[PDB]
Design a binder for this molecule. Sequence first.
Ligand SMILES: Cc1nn(-c2nc3c(Cl)c(Cl)ccc3[nH]2)c(O)c1[C@H]1OC(=O)c2ccccc21
Ligand SMILES: [Zn+2]
Length: 346
Amino acid sequence: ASKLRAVLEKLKLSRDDISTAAGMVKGVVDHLLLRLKCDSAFRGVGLLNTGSYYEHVKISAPNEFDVMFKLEVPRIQLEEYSNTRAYYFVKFKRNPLSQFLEGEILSASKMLSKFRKIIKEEINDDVIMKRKRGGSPAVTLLISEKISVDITLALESKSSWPASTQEGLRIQNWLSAKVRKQLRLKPFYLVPKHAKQEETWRLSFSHIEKEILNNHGKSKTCCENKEEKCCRKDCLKLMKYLLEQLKERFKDEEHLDKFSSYHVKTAFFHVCTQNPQDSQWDRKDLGLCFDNCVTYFLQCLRTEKLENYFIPEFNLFSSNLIDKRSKEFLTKQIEYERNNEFPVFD
Ligand SMILES: Cc1nn(-c2nc3c(Cl)c(Cl)ccc3[nH]2)c(O)c1[C@H]1OC(=O)c2ccccc21
Ligand SMILES: [Zn+2]
């Protein structure tokens, strides 16, 4: 539709005026990184080798930056927490981070305390500091009351991926078995995150998601020339913007608080697996391809089944995580939008 392309254009224009905001953020990040390196506990801190200082959780909020600080640590040993499949206690194989030990277990709260305290005393050099909920992001910088920067601490592990990822990343018929093998040789990450326990760490594969999104076709030259333009990334942007607009419209009702961009990005990767050919994503079929993403997301809400793309036993739409009414709420809203050609995009 012409409205979908209209939305994408405006999302693109609001993105283009950011190279000045990025430079600022990059300056604050390089400063905090040098400061964190001074402390003996965070000597191995750095950025994920993803090719960017930052990401944007919300495509409609170019002023809200998101940054991850990775921590190179000695070989980590992982104890699953309570069959949650994605949350773990962190331990050291053999006897620098010893100050954060609560016995044999690496303490997230003790490491969060020092991380936050160090960044608190460093923003005193037009930047205030704020802290939020969960454990991740750990802190939130506020630059000139116009730009926010969420910062997440992440432990880096070069061990093999956890057992719960064994049947995930089902890209073999899309991106190939060779690629899946290469990707699973890369490190994984753990972010401090409470489990509904205060000292757990949650797996993070955001760096793998980025690699897939930026190298997304069956053809190695997908989107590198005019003959091979697909609408995969445009469809993901529209799904993100859809959810972002619904959460903004219903922010003062409760039923959408448990949904996030992680849910639409997960459902999108499943649709890429279901439609592995570049010819199922021709730029001229944007409206049909976007509709395919909407209706797959609805099927997930109705059946209350949204498997984590990396950890297939973790059901993101589990009753234990999101109440059946909330999913019925969102199913209704999306059906309404679909049936009325998406007023939220007007
Ligand atoms: C970036 C991100 N990744 N991510 C995620 N959720 C996962 C689940 Cl549920 C399983 Cl089972 C396995 C792996 C998961 N990765 C997730 O929720 C988020 C958002 O929330 C955060 O932590 C956060 C912090 C800063 C910005 C954005 C977010
Ligand atoms: Zn492409």
